[PDB]
Curated annotation (Swiss-Prot):
Residues 705-713 are annotated as: Catalytic loop. The lineage of its organism: Eukaryota, Metazoa, Chordata, Craniata, Vertebrata. This is Phosphatidylinositol 4,5-bisphosphate 3-kinase catalytic subunit gamma isoform. Residues 566-572 are annotated as: G-loop. One of its GO terms (biological process) is angiogenesis. It comes from Homo sapiens (Human).
Length: 836
């Protein structure tokens, strides 16, 4: 079409980081099928969204105000600071008051209504029919004892969000012709065979092998591999998994296509090589490197899918099976029970995952029965939304489209606040979808387009994977495009700015990394080289401003080249600082960002996100363990940015400043906090905060099995908020060393008010998380499968079961954690010292 449309597809390609019109690494048209398929869902949502609210994207929650936040409001009054150039009043408000109805208690209380309240220095609005106590920014300020500063100004023009117009009962068999690799001369000559598996929801329905042969640059067999399973019995979503054993290579091919047709014809698939379980193994995409990759040739020639009340003790066996964690293995007995009492099972939403693990997906009639089961879904459709449960049906174990769709059905009812909490994991979850186009993928696209905040992170979460996952960049790219084609020219403009910026800093970051070895030091030479490179961008290259990717509410302006530098650490990360591009800003404090290479940030994001879930969990029990999950977004391979927490120091650096360089003293920390405390009130506040934050992290860290940390990866704010960092990748359950204890007023396994307060918070926090054992267990395993390398689909994922002390009662749990606390006391500084 118009040269205009080509220039647009060019722009999109740049934002995405992939050409979705590319057909270099495909063997069918699913992707294209999918691009077209998403048009409707896109358009249906664009069309449905209120142009006004979409432009102002208010950030609101339906959850009640925690108890620990009402404490700061013991007068049913809240002070809002309304600025107006040099003006600035202080209208006292009621937590129930609406933004439109405090703008009344202003305009009239002072004395024309085409105005809207906006947070000073931010792109955050307090609009919409919502209690001011329900806006997040407001709760952010209460939780941090900050004043609410707002500016009266004109609503953003929803015209700016304009969208560009668009325009057989035979047995199954497969013939393995042979394998080919360009170069293979290796050490000791080993043997090699091909394993052809038919899988569904990671479950082998049938398995056939070829005879062992000499591993040469070309091995042929020309042998038909026949399976017992009928062509009429293959389940949609079934995957023909082909692997080469010496396991060296793998590759999958959807047995039924996106059009319900049985795969047929000759295929030459370029395989993935295992690096000397995880999501990546389930991919329907083929290695893009056709030149230096192993490949397997095959031939397919064969469309389809054209009362009784439980006795007392059996219902008991059933209920026990249902109460077991999601990691409890299911016995044949168990599956037969769940299946036979198929309809009783159907009354227990918590049984759903276990029940669908009990279906024989390899049997046409049974699956057939299963669908009839899901038909009478009344109970499920009326169940109180259980995210944990919903996610479980979205993991690697369920490949069935109808099973997965009901989980998504449940997600529909999440308010935006909630989608943000799980947004990163839901996105990862897409690696578990058998087809590109899926209910999940559509959910995301929708939720994205309907709210700007959610689309923004969706953008970056997808970009993250598209830039470094060979196994899923294709699918993720088609989804992202879809989104881009509907977020709005405005968004499309912001993204452009953000992409050019980080794309420059990434180049400088890497080039600088070359001019520096590993041996920590950092010379003025390398810093001089940085300042020069930045100077160059400061010119006509680096846009005037851009949104901070991990904090869309913040607009960043020009670099403060004088405050930038290269950090003296193993990796050589940039420490940039920018001026806030918002005049209405309430400060002159710069925005500090860290650009690093060497670490896999996608992992970091995952932990950080799980950390925020843990917060919300503790919220619903009136707890605030003061964690500090800083901004973090992986932008490419082993590269990305990190929010610079203001006024914080490494606990190691604190020790180093007192004792030797590579040298440990017990009072260092307490000394540091007191000297950093402006008054005695704030110093006492900071010891408090330390006790809470210390317990939060000791608990969060224990559950996620990443508590045994080195001193240089644990920070603390001058205000006392302790917090770990770099979750890149004798023992101790967590870090609770003598110096942390000293701050609490105890030493040599003694006692004190603070230490007992600490132990109280820990246990309270710990059993609060056990109240969500299932939600966490499912987040932990999905994390392991889409974030780590080859995670043991057993022992690894199983840690969290023992950590959350599954099975034990609350008393034995509390007992259990307190003992963990003692193991830290007995170890003192042993482990810290050892960390080398």
């Amino acid at each position: 079409m118009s040269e205009e449309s080509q220039a647009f597809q060019r722009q999109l390609t740049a934002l995405i980081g992939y050409d979705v019109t590319d057909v270099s690494n495909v063997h069918d048209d699913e992707l294209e099928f999918t691009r077209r398929g998403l048009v409707t869902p896109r358009m249906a949502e664009v069309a449905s969204r209120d142009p006004k609210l979409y432009a102002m994207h208010p950030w609101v929650t339906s959850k009640p105000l925690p108890e620990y936040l009402w404490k700061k409001i013991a007068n049913n009054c809240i002070f809002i600071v309304i600025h107006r150039s040099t003006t600035s009043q202080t209208i006292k408000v009621s937590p129930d008051d609406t933004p439109g109805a405090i703008l009344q208690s202003f305009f009239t209380k002072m004395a024309e209504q085409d105005f809207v309240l906006r947070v000073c220095g931010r792109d955050e609005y307090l609009v919409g029919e919502t209690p001011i106590k329900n806006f997040q920014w407001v709760r952010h300020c209460l939780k941090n004892g900050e004043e609410i500063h707002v500016v009266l100004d004109t609503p953003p023009d929803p015209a700016l969000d304009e969208v560009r117009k668009e325009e057989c009962d035979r047995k199954f068999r497969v013939k393995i012709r042979g394998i080919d690799i360009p170069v293979l001369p290796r050490n000791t000559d080993l043997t090699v065979f091909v394993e052809a598996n038919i899988q569904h929801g990671q479950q082998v329905l049938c398995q056939r092998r070829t005879s062992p042969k000499p591993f040469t640059e070309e091995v042929l067999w020309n042998v038909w591999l026949e399976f017992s399973i009928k062509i009429k019995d293959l389940p949609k979503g079934a995957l023909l998994n082909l692997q080469i054993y010496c396991l060296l290579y793998y590759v999958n091919l959807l047995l039924i296509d996106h059009r319900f047709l049985l795969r047929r014809g000759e295929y030459v698939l370029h395989m993935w090589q295992i690096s000397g379980f995880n999501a990546d193994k389930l991919t329907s995409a083929t290695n893009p490197d056709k030149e230096n990759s192993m490949s397997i040739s095959i031939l397919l020639d064969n469309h389809p899918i054209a009362r009784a009340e439980m006795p007392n003790q059996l219902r008991k066996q059933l209920e026990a099976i249902i109460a077991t964690d999601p990691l409890n293995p299911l016995t044949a007995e168990d599956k037969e029970l769940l299946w036979h009492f198929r309809y009783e099972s159907l009354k227990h939403p918590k049984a759903y995952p276990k029940l669908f693990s009990s279906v024989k997906w390899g049997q046409q009639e049974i699956v057939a029965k299963t669908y009839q089961l899901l038909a009478r879904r009344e109970v499920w459709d009326q169940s109180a939304l259980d995210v944990g449960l919903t996610m479980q049906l979205l993991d690697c174990n369920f490949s069935d489209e109808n099973v997965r769709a009901i989980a998504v059905q449940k997600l529909e009812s999440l308010e935006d606040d909630d989608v943000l909490h799980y947004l990163l994991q839901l996105v990862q979850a897409v690696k578990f979808e058998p087809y590109h186009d899926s209910a999940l993928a559509r959910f995301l696209l929708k939720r994205g387009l309907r709210n700007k905040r959610i689309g923004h992170f969706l953008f970056w979460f997808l970009r993250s994977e598209i830039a470094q996952s060979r196994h899923y960049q294709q699918r993720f790219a088609v989804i992202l495009e879809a989104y881009l084609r509907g977020c709005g020219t405005a968004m499309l403009h912001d993204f452009t700015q953000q992409v050019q910026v980080i794309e420059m800093l990434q180049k400088v970051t890497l080039d600088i990394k070359s001019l520096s070895a590993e041996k920590y030091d950092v010379s003025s030479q390398v810093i001089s080289q940085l300042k020069q490179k930045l100077e160059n961008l400061q010119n006509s290259q680096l846009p005037e401003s851009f949104r901070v990717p991990y904090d869309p509410g913040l607009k960043a302006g020009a670099l403060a080249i004088e405050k930038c530098k290269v950090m003296a650490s193993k990796k050589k990360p940039l420490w940039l600082e920018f001026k806030c591009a918002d005049p209405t800003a309430l400060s002159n404090e710069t925005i500090g960002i860290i650009f690093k290479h060497g670490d896999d940030l996608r992992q970091d994001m995952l932990i950080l996100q799980i950390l925020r879930i843990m917060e919300s969990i503790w919220e619903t029990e009136s707890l605030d363990l003061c964690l500090l999950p800083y901004g973090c977004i992986s932008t490419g391979d082993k590269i990305g940015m990190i929010e610079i927490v203001k006024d914080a120091t490494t606990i190691a650096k604190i020790q180093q400043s007192t004792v030797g360089n590579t040298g440990f003293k017990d009072e260092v920390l307490n000394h540091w906090l007191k000297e950093k405390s402006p008054t005695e009130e704030k110093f006492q506040a900071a010891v408090e905060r330390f006790v809470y934050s210390c317990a939060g992290y000791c608990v969060a860290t224990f559950v996620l099995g990443i508590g045994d940390r080195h001193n240089d990866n644990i920070m603390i704010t001058e205000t006392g908020n302790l917090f770990h960092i770099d979750f890149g990748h004798e023992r101790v359950p967590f870090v609770l060393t003598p110096d942390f204890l000293f701050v609490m007023g105890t030493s040599g396994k003694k006692t004190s008010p603070h230490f007992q307060k600490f132990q109280d918070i820990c246990v309270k926090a710990y059993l609060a998380l056990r109240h969500h054992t299932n939600l966490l267990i499912i987040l932990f395993s999905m994390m392991l499968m889409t974030g780590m390398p080859q995670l043991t689909s057993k022992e690894d994922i199983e840690y969290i079961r023992d950590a959350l002390t599954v099975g034990k009662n609350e008393e034995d749990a509390k007992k259990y954690f307190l003992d963990q606390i003692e193991v830290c006391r007995d170890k003192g500084w042993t482990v810290q010292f050892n960390w080398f």
